Design a protein around this ligand. Structure first.
Ligand SMILES: *[C@@H]1O[C@H](CO)[C@@H](O[C@@H]2O[C@H](CO)[C@@H](O[C@@H]3O[C@H](CO[C@H]4O[C@H](CO)[C@@H](O)[C@H](O[C@H]5O[C@H](CO)[C@@H](O)[C@H](O)[C@@H]5O)[C@@H]4O)[C@@H](O)[C@H](O[C@H]4O[C@H](CO)[C@@H](O)[C@H](O)[C@@H]4O[C@H]4O[C@H](CO)[C@@H](O)[C@H](O)[C@@H]4O[C@H]4O[C@H](CO)[C@@H](O)[C@H](O)[C@@H]4O)[C@@H]3O)[C@H](O)[C@H]2NC(C)=O)[C@H](O)[C@H]1NC(C)=O
Ligand SMILES: *[C@@H]1O[C@H](CO)[C@@H](O[C@@H]2O[C@H](CO)[C@@H](O[C@@H]3O[C@H](CO[C@H]4O[C@H](CO)[C@@H](O)[C@H](O)[C@@H]4O)[C@@H](O)[C@H](O[C@H]4O[C@H](CO)[C@@H](O)[C@H](O)[C@@H]4O[C@H]4O[C@H](CO)[C@@H](O)[C@H](O)[C@@H]4O)[C@@H]3O)[C@H](O)[C@H]2NC(C)=O)[C@H](O)[C@H]1NC(C)=O
Ligand SMILES: *[C@@H]1O[C@H](CO)[C@@H](O[C@@H]2O[C@H](CO)[C@@H](O[C@@H]3O[C@H](CO)[C@@H](O)[C@H](O[C@H]4O[C@H](CO)[C@@H](O)[C@H](O)[C@@H]4O)[C@@H]3O)[C@H](O)[C@H]2NC(C)=O)[C@H](O)[C@H]1NC(C)=O
Ligand SMILES: *[C@@H]1O[C@H](CO)[C@@H](O[C@@H]2O[C@H](CO)[C@@H](O[C@@H]3O[C@H](CO)[C@@H](O)[C@H](O[C@H]4O[C@H](CO)[C@@H](O)[C@H](O)[C@@H]4O)[C@@H]3O)[C@H](O)[C@H]2NC(C)=O)[C@H](O)[C@H]1NC(C)=O
Ligand SMILES: *[C@@H]1O[C@H](CO)[C@@H](O[C@@H]2O[C@H](CO)[C@@H](O[C@@H]3O[C@H](CO)[C@@H](O)[C@H](O)[C@@H]3O)[C@H](O)[C@H]2NC(C)=O)[C@H](O)[C@H]1NC(C)=O
Ligand SMILES: *[C@@H]1O[C@H](CO)[C@@H](O[C@@H]2O[C@H](CO)[C@@H](O[C@@H]3O[C@H](CO)[C@@H](O)[C@H](O)[C@@H]3O)[C@H](O)[C@H]2NC(C)=O)[C@H](O)[C@H]1NC(C)=O
Ligand SMILES: *[C@@H]1O[C@H](CO)[C@@H](O[C@@H]2O[C@H](CO)[C@@H](O)[C@H](O)[C@H]2NC(C)=O)[C@H](O)[C@H]1NC(C)=O
Ligand SMILES: *[C@@H]1O[C@H](CO)[C@@H](O[C@@H]2O[C@H](CO)[C@@H](O)[C@H](O)[C@H]2NC(C)=O)[C@H](O)[C@H]1NC(C)=O
Ligand SMILES: *[C@@H]1O[C@H](CO)[C@@H](O[C@@H]2O[C@H](CO)[C@@H](O)[C@H](O)[C@H]2NC(C)=O)[C@H](O)[C@H]1NC(C)=O
Ligand SMILES: *[C@@H]1O[C@H](CO)[C@@H](O[C@@H]2O[C@H](CO)[C@@H](O)[C@H](O)[C@H]2NC(C)=O)[C@H](O)[C@H]1NC(C)=O
Ligand SMILES: *[C@@H]1O[C@H](CO)[C@@H](O[C@@H]2O[C@H](CO)[C@@H](O)[C@H](O)[C@H]2NC(C)=O)[C@H](O)[C@H]1NC(C)=O
Ligand SMILES: *[C@@H]1O[C@H](CO)[C@@H](O[C@@H]2O[C@H](CO)[C@@H](O)[C@H](O)[C@H]2NC(C)=O)[C@H](O)[C@H]1NC(C)=O
Ligand SMILES: *[C@@H]1O[C@H](CO)[C@@H](O[C@@H]2O[C@H](CO)[C@@H](O)[C@H](O)[C@H]2NC(C)=O)[C@H](O)[C@H]1NC(C)=O
Ligand SMILES: *[C@@H]1O[C@H](CO)[C@@H](O[C@@H]2O[C@H](CO)[C@@H](O)[C@H](O)[C@H]2NC(C)=O)[C@H](O)[C@H]1NC(C)=O
Ligand SMILES: *[C@@H]1O[C@H](CO)[C@@H](O)[C@H](O)[C@H]1NC(C)=O
Ligand SMILES: *[C@@H]1O[C@H](CO)[C@@H](O)[C@H](O)[C@H]1NC(C)=O
Ligand SMILES: *[C@@H]1O[C@H](CO)[C@@H](O)[C@H](O)[C@H]1NC(C)=O
Ligand SMILES: *[C@@H]1O[C@H](CO)[C@@H](O)[C@H](O)[C@H]1NC(C)=O
Ligand SMILES: *[C@@H]1O[C@H](CO)[C@@H](O)[C@H](O)[C@H]1NC(C)=O
Lengths: 404, 194, 339, 339
């Protein structure tokens, strides 16, 4: 497997971690008819023969969109994509009906995620929104290895280590390790976007007021990254973090733009145990005048405990704030944690969000010390930097489905 | 008449509804409030009543257009049944038209058509032409006549009413070669038919 | 008097005696309904607030004014709400002299300039912060306090001052249930008054089983619920209203039949057919032969039975043709006049 | 060629649409009783005036109906038009072979206007359909008069009237001779050997088959054959347009309940949970006024639709009187050539 760089979205002279629907193993068959179960296919053709690929369900219908690709090799790659309704090859309603002249020696491919039909084409990545296209499970292949037609079949969500050197994909290795990385790690595309088909595991919407439930609605949210630091392993002896990925320990993933950011999206690793999810430590901010100290405990006379729970819990916790103004130690009460702490977001202009709800507000923040004492490094999945942009979100059950 | 009354009975009845004001009487407002405070109240009544008048006019115009659509059919029926005796089936009356009489009515005309209806009918032994000597064939020119046989006597009548008479020479044409189901007769005894 | 099932139609349509035809009917019932509450997950924490008033009498005249009245919130002059749930009462102390001399004096609250009521804060109203008080604070509405002697003459004694701000954090509660870690309630199978994810209405809640992944709230295009879903499982629920309108036929100053949509007996009527898109309820015979009223595709006869409508017969002969056969030519005639 | 002869009768309930099931609006609508009797009367009168005029046309014959059989048409294959006799039920005649191919296109996309079952809207156990979601707001669709049966008895009475010559009692002339009487009206046929009927039989059957294949939605292969698609495409577009314009009126009437007017919220139960009874009536009145103003604008459109359909039935009666029974000679009438 040797694809381009634009079909994978990696930089030059680096080594990233790429997740998603990716090809694994090639086939060499001559059975001339096979009904697979799949979600996509790549192929390479140089042979003068009709080679047609088609996705469909297991039964005929008169209100279903079917995908049909036909190569007819002449001097270049004549490809005919036709996403059309059929009449037992009588197309009468075509979302797309085109004809591409493609460079010979470059593999093509289609993947399906939700109601979105992607299209990899070795130089661009075009995206269509076919209604009711999640049902297309089967795959009918008319390909002959004797005419030099080879093809791969995509199942699901592979984690791949990729090494590049001067525009050439050098190594390509599948993790038999890398448990759980398919839902929390990705690689940043061009201009700081987030790739398609990424299930937002702990990516909440931020708010100053009520919470949305369902429906399509424009927003203004921090969803344009400038770095991503996967598996950080923060310790008790790391220090501060100064809102830019130009330090000495930051190992960004994919593209890496130097700019100044607004938020820092944390992400919490928690197991179904409720005993190992009780971490002991504080959070130290850094304002212009005096440091602000945050902690939580389970009794209202909170002078004997310092914990922060992760994940699910069983009894309510109370959360405080210390400060110091000329040996006058000041304490206050802020609120209750929700029953499952999952994400912590800190902005530059003072604010502090837990699961997307504002608790307090400082004046101006320069650095954050997340001081947690632990005997391992396994506490966080990722630490992301971001800026505000204009998006369009399909909210479903207070989560995110798509993003535009 | 009912549809003409129910529009005015609905237009007048929208004066009882005060809008978001104190009362639906304009004199009752100026007996209570100052002049600088009353205009905001009076404006809310003025707006709703103008909005009612526009909705009245937009209905009256459609009624006029429907009546313009309906006068033309009356002009056509006056032109074609009173003065002309048309022959279109399913027009004036459901049968055979003779004449029509007009009288007036509340906002319109009242027609009185006059048709015919059959009561009895006769059984008739028809034919379809005469073939003389197996070669020369004669048939009727007009397609509204019937040549028949009252037991050795041939007569010609119409197809709509029963009016018999004798056949003459000016009704026959010559259409060579004699379909089978004609009347076999030689040329010598042709004068017993015609 | 409106007790019998025909007299209630006269009470509904505000008319003595009714013309023949089809009438609509839907008889609501006033009753006290239980209450359900389902909301997003959060813990439970409560606080209590009294509002007392203690008085004495007997200055120079009784009927003119009371002698001295004290007002206090929990013994203080101000109480702010720092928790997630609250509830307010009103307490008037008649045991001041032991023997209740307050049996004649009636002290109660009025309705001031606030955009809500005092006795309906214990319903599920949502705020952001409140901070009640009994002394003057700028930017605050008020509830006056009134005193009287057998409702002859009125006077104003004190007030209750209240601030707020809008939000979705603090919620009123009817009564402090203790022991529950997360407050919710659900009452099935007959008519309630629900408050489900900030949708408020009435209806009957039932349980079902469908495999629908996706949202947790299903609405129509007019803003009503049709079904919601519990979070920590996959079961859904169905919400239907419990008052369905009908069609009633009235003839000879009595009720003949009905066009219902509920499989049961109805107002005075016993028998029950089953037509292809409703249920028909009458009590007539089955031998009627002639019709007095009409509907879409039948005719309701004189005592309640149904008669289907037959088409008109008509005979015709076609165009006569050139043939060697026997024909039929009209001979005699008559006339008729049409309008 | 396509025409329209009827529409869909709507009967709206008043108090369910304005104030859904709340017994406090029933006190406040008493001051508008004369303002909502006239809404229901204006619909129940027009729904009867359509019924009388539609049932005035659809006659029936018996001796012409028995000659509607495929053994009485000679060499002309007319089997895809005649009605099917026995559906193994209590039906005299069902639909034809062409009507089902029409109904397979657009009726399943209707979903809110045809054959709605009201018996299952009151059981729960499912998320409600679009048609049952409107019955919770009073909007009811009555059945029509012309069902599957009468349109199969009126149509078969006209197709069977072709071969009925002017013989004695009930004899039928052959259909090869019934065109001889319709060609002599044009010019006198002076050929003793029917040579034209071979070519006419060879052409008419292909003309039927291309039209039957045209409605099968296999369109791009038959479009470049001849200009028969040019006549069928306009008729299909008109049949689709009728259904879309019938749906878009109700989809706009229901959608005006989300709009609160200048009040607190668009839910009537949400107001009485918050305010006192003396303060809530001013809020509820602002909703009542706007909803009555919506209902009047609905009625004033339904009446114009009925008037247009009354305008369109007369042309259908004229064409039935002049082309099916008469063989007119007006140029530019039925067909663009010689009828
Ligand atoms: C924006 O966000 C939206 C909110 O999430 C999102 O819309 C939602 O999309 C999902 C699809 O992922 C819908 O999920 C439902 O899934 C049901 C389960 O079956 C599928 O899902 C599994 C996991 O994906 C698969 O494993 C499963 O395969 C299994 O089952 C197969 C069949 O048994 C079997 O062959 C396999 O081997 C395997 O065993 C399968 O793939 C599914 O049952 C459900 O059915 C819908 O589709 C059927 C066919 O169209 C209908 O019969 C059925 O009733 C459902 O259709 C309804 O919804 C459509 C779209 O809303 C309407 O067009 C239909 O008319 C119908 O609507 C009626 O019913 C509504 C209530 O259901 C009602 O509200 C309407 O008024 C109307 O009366 C469906 O696939 C999920 O339902 C979607 N959400 C909503 C609200 O519809 C959307 O995709 C996002 N936007 C974009 C661009 O992505
Ligand atoms: C909950 O509610 C709170 C309400 O306060 C809300 O907080 C506010 O968020 C906004 C969004 O960030 C803060 O507004 C500003 O955002 C701009 C974004 O830049 C845009 O515009 C500039 C110019 O148009 C473009 O260059 C840029 O590309 C974007 O289009 C920031 O740039 C602002 O930062 C300023 O201050 C920094 C420190 O001083 C400077 O380094 C920076 O350059 C900016 O300075 C500029 O603006 C100053 C304004 O006076 C001006 O004086 C300077 O000379 C210079 O021109 C700033 O972040 C807004 O400040 C927040 N409110 C408060 C009180 O801080 C939350 O967002 C809301 N929650 C949610 C989820 O929405
Ligand atoms: C996010 O947090 C989770 C917290 O559970 C964390 O999962 C654990 O990671 C470790 C590796 O980091 C997994 O591997 C273990 O490593 C030790 C090292 O010696 C082994 O001894 C363990 O073996 C035991 O557990 C096996 C599985 O139950 C048994 O089969 C075996 O007999 C031993 O008892 C084991 O290999 C560890 O399994 C997971 N925990 C779970 C529950 O899976 C995760 O790594 C964190 N994520 C990141 C990105 O850091
Ligand atoms: C007048 O025209 C009508 C319609 O134009 C015509 O009716 C048609 O008759 C044919 C047979 O005469 C029918 O065709 C068959 O339909 C059945 C239905 O299931 C099919 O199973 C049949 O398929 C078998 O036979 C085929 C040919 O032998 C094989 O190729 C196939 O593999 C199967 O073995 C066959 O298609 C047709 O369905 C009807 N049409 C309708 C609408 O019912 C009628 O015969 C004509 N009459 C005259 C006198 O010309
Ligand atoms: C007028 O006279 C002529 C000749 O005299 C009749 O023509 C012939 O009529 C017969 C029967 O009417 C036709 O049928 C034939 O019958 C014999 C059996 O005898 C059979 O073998 C033949 O095959 C044929 O079926 C005959 O065809 C016909 N002659 C011709 C040349 O067509 C005529 O019928 C008489 N007119 C009337 C009204 O009877
Ligand atoms: C509408 O409600 C009526 C009730 O008045 C239903 O009629 C009853 O239906 C049942 C079953 O369909 C009939 O059978 C009976 O069942 C019971 C229980 O299984 C059994 O104990 C009896 O011996 C008998 O078999 C019953 O006869 C019938 N009632 C009458 C008076 O005929 C009707 O089914 C309901 N309609 C629908 C669509 O549910
Ligand atoms: C990144 O941001 C920091 C803080 O805004 C900039 O300042 C220095 O950062 C280094 C380590 O990141 C510290 O050791 C210095 O003490 C910081 N200086 C000050 C005055 O705070 C830093 O320059 C920024 N990076 C780039 C490349 O501009
Ligand atoms: C971060 O947390 C660690 C562990 O809680 C802190 O280290 C302790 O610091 C106190 C300060 O006097 C010492 O007495 C302890 O002996 C230290 N413990 C260890 C294990 O080193 C550290 O000070 C915290 N950092 C900040 C900035 O608060
Ligand atoms: C209202 O409050 C005042 C203030 O406390 C009460 O007046 C006190 O009454 C007690 C009982 O006799 C006396 O011992 C105190 O000396 C009074 N205080 C003052 C400052 O004079 C008054 O009793 C309260 N009203 C009622 C009805 O109990
Ligand atoms: C009317 O008089 C009787 C007795 O004279 C009062 O009864 C007692 O009055 C004393 C002093 O006022 C109180 O301390 C006792 O508590 C009263 N007894 C009881 C059982 O309450 C009575 O209160 C007088 N009525 C008034 C003052 O309204
Ligand atoms: C059904 O009704 C018909 C008439 O509507 C009844 O026929 C007559 O009924 C009267 C009184 O019931 C009798 O005096 C006659 O003798 C009946 N005549 C005939 C020819 O029957 C008929 O009896 C009714 N049938 C039933 C079962 O009630
Ligand atoms: C029309 O003519 C038929 C017979 O020529 C009459 O006879 C029957 O009447 C009963 C009574 O409803 C019907 O159920 C039968 O279906 C009729 N027979 C047939 C063959 O239709 C009938 O009464 C006449 N009148 C009407 C109005 O249909
Ligand atoms: C046409 O009508 C004539 C009489 O008008 C029919 O001749 C009669 O036929 C019947 C057969 O049922 C015989 O019983 C009579 O004796 C005949 N009478 C006479 C005077 O001929 C003749 O059958 C009818 N049909 C045709 C085809 O000619
Ligand atoms: C045309 O006439 C034939 C008579 O041969 C009808 O065929 C009969 O139809 C009935 C309907 O149930 C069947 O029970 C018989 O078995 C059929 N007989 C034969 C010999 O086929 C046919 O139905 C008629 N067509 C129409 C449209 O009425
Ligand atoms: C795809 O999945 C099937 C079973 O789900 C598996 O047998 C097959 O080996 C997979 N494809 C590859 C290339 O591993
Ligand atoms: C990916 O490959 C590079 C090249 O050797 C290696 O340095 C890196 O550790 C690999 N990543 C993982 C997670 O093994
Ligand atoms: C408030 O009331 C409490 C009793 O609940 C009392 O102990 C306290 O002194 C009061 N404080 C003030 C300022 O009145
Ligand atoms: C209806 O609700 C009441 C609640 O008071 C309950 O007691 C009763 O069992 C329920 N069911 C019926 C059929 O009354
Ligand atoms: C589940 O659905 C079936 C469908 O008929 C229904 O009979 C049953 O009552 C439902 N509930 C349970 C608990 O099985």
């Amino acid at each position: 497997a040797n694809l381009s760089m634009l079909q994978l979205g990696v930089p030059d002279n680096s080594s990233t971690i790429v997740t998603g629907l990716l090809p694994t193993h090639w086939f060499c068959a001559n059975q001339s008819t096979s009904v697979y179960s799949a979600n996509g296919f790549f192929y390479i053709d140089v042979g003068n023969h009709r080679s047609a690929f088609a996705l469909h369900t297991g039964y005929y219908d008169a209100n279903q969109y079917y995908i049909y690709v036909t190569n007819e090799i002449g001097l270049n790659a004549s490809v005919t994509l036709k996403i059309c309704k059929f009449s037992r090859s009588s197309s009468f309603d075509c979302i797309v009906n085109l004809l591409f002249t493609e460079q010979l020696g470059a593999p093509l491919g289609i993947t399906i995620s939700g109601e979105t039909v992607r299209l990899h084409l070795y130089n661009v990545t075009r995206t269509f929104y076919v209604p009711a296209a999640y049902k297309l499970t089967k795959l009918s292949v008319k390909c002959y290895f004797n005419y030099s037609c080879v093809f791969s079949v995509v199942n699901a969500t592979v984690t791949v280590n990729v090494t590049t050197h001067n525009g050439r994909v050098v190594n390509y290795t599948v993790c038999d390790d890398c448990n759980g990385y398919t839902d929390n790690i990705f690689s940043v595309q061009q201009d700081g976007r987030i790739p398609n088909g990424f299930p937002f595991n702990n990516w909440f919407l931020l708010t100053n007021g009520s919470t949305l439930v369902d429906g399509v609605s424009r927003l203004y949210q921090p969803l344009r990254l400038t770095c991503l630091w996967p598996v950080p392993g923060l310790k008790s002896s790391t220090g501060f973090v100064y809102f830019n990925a130009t330090g000495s320990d930051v190992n960004c993933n994919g593209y890496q733009h130097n700019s100044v950011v607004d938020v820092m999206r944390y992400n919490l690793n928690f197991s179904a145990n409720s005993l190992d999810n009780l971490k002991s430590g504080v959070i130290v901010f850094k304002t212009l005048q005096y440091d602000v100290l945050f902690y939580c405990s389970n009794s209202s006379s909170g002078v004997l405990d310092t914990t922060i729970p992760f994940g699910p819990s069983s009894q309510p916790y109370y959360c405080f704030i210390n400060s110091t103004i000329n040996t006058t130690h000041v304490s206050t009460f802020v609120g209750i944690l929700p029953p499952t702490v999952r994400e912590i977001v800190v902005a530059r202009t003072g604010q502090f969000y837990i699961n997307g709800f504002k608790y307090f507000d400082l004046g101006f923040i320069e650095a954050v010390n997340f001081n947690v004492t632990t005997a391992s490094a396994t506490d966080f999945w990722t630490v992301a930097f971001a800026t505000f942009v204009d998006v369009l979100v399909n909210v479903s059950a207070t989560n995110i489905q798509n993003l535009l | 008449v009912n549809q003409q009354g129910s529009a005015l009975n609905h237009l007048t009845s929208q004066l009882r509804h005060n809008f978001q004001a104190i009362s639906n009487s304009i004199q009752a407002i100026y007996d209570r409030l100052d002049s600088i405070q009353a205009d905001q109240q009076v404006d809310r009544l003025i707006t709703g009543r103008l909005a009612a008048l526009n909705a009245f006019v937009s209905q009256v115009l459609n009624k006029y257009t429907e009546v313009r659509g309906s006068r033309r059919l009356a002009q056509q029926k006056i032109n074609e049944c009173v003065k002309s005796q048309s022959n279109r089936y399913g027009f004036c009356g459901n049968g055979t038209h003779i004449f029509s009489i007009v009288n007036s009515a509340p906002d319109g005309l009242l027609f009185l058509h006059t048709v015919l209806l059959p009561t009895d009918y006769k059984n008739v032994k028809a034919w379809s032409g005469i073939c003389v000597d197996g070669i020369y064939g004669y048939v009727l020119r007009q397609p509204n006549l019937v040549l028949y046989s009252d037991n050795g006597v041939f007569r010609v009548t119409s197809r709509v009413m029963f009016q018999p008479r004798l056949p003459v020479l000016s009704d026959f044409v010559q259409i060579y070669n004699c379909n089978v189901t004609f009347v076999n007769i030689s040329r010598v005894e042709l004068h017993t038919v015609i | 008097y409106c007790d019998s099932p025909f007299e209630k139609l006269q009470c509904e349509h505000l008319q003595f005696g009714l013309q023949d035809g089809f009438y609509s009917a839907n008889f609501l019932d006033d009753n006290v309904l239980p209450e359900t509450y389902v909301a997003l997950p959060i813990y439970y924490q409560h606080t209590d607030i009294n509002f007392t008033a203690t008085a004495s009498f007997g200055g120079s005249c009784y009927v003119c004014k009371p002698h001295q009245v004290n007002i206090s919130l929990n013994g203080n002059t101000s109480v702010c709400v720092r928790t997630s749930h609250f509830s307010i009462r009103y307490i008037y102390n008649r045991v001041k002299s032991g023997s209740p001399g307050d049996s004649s004096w009636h002290i109660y609250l009025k309705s001031g300039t606030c955009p809500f009521s005092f006795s309906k804060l214990n319903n599920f109203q949502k705020f952001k912060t409140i901070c009640f008080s009994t002394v003057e604070v700028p930017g605050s509405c008020n509830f006056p306090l009134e005193a009287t002697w057998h409702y002859t003459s009125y006077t104003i004694v004190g007030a209750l001052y209240v601030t707020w701000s809008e939000g979705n954090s603090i919620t009123g509660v009817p009564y402090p249930v203790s022991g529950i870690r997360e407050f919710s309630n659900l009452v099935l199978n007959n008519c309630t008054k629900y408050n489900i994810y900030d949708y408020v209405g009435t209806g009957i809640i039932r349980s079902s089983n469908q495999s629908l992944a996706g949202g947790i709230t299903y609405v129509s295009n007019s803003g009503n619920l049709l079904g919601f879903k519990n979070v920590s499982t996959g079961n859904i629920f169905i919400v239907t209203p419990c008052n369905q309108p009908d069609q009633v036929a009235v003839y000879q100053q009595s009720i003949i039949g009905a066009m219902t949509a509920v499989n049961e007996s109805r107002y005075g009527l016993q028998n029950l057919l089953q037509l292809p898109n409703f249920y028909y309820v009458s009590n007539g015979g089955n031998n009627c032969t002639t019709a007095v009223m009409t509907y879409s595709n039948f005719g309701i006869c004189a005592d309640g039975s149904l008669i289907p409508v037959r088409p008109r017969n008509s005979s015709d002969n076609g165009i006569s043709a050139i043939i060697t056969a026997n024909l039929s030519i009209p001979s005699n005639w008559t006339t008729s006049v049409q309008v | 060629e396509y025409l329209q002869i009827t529409s869909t009768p709507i009967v709206v309930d008043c108090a369910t649409y304005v104030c859904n099931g709340n017994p406090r609006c029933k006190n406040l609508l008493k001051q508008y009783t004369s303002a909502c009797k006239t809404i229901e009367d204006a619909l129940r009168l027009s729904a009867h005036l359509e019924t009388n005029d539609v049932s005035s046309m659809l006659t029936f014959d018996s001796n012409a109906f028995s000659l509607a059989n495929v053994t009485s048409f000679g060499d002309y294959n007319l089997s895809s038009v005649l009605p099917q006799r026995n559906i193994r039920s209590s039906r005299i005649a069902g639909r034809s072979a062409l009507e089902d191919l029409l109904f397979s296109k657009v009726v399943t996309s209707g979903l809110g206007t045809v054959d709605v079952d009201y018996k299952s809207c009151t059981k729960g156990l499912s998320i409600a359909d679009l048609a049952c979601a409107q019955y919770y707001n009073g909007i009811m669709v009555l059945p029509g008069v012309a069902d599957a049966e009468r349109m199969a008895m009126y149509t078969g009475s006209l197709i069977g009237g072709m071969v009925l010559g002017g013989l004695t009692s009930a004899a039928a002339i052959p259909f090869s001779l019934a065109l001889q009487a319709r060609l002599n009206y044009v010019a006198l046929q002076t050929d003793v050997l029917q040579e034209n009927q071979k070519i006419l039989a060879a052409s008419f059957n292909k003309a039927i088959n291309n039209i039957v294949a045209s409605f099968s939605s296999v369109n791009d292969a038959i479009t470049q054959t001849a200009e028969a698609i040019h006549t069928v495409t306009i008729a299909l577009n008109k049949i689709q347009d009728v259904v879309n314009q019938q749906g878009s009126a109700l989809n706009h009437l229901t959608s005006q309940l989300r709009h609160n007017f200048q009040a607190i919220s668009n839910s009537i139960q949400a107001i009485y949970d918050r305010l006192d009874s003396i303060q809530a009536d001013q809020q509820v009145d602002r909703l009542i006024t706007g909803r009555l103003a919506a209902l009047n604008a609905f009625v004033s459109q339904v009446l114009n639709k009925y008037t247009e359909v009354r305008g369109s039935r007369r042309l259908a009666q004229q064409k039935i009187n002049e082309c099916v029974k008469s063989q007119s000679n007006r140029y530019g009438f039925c067909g663009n050539g010689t009828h």
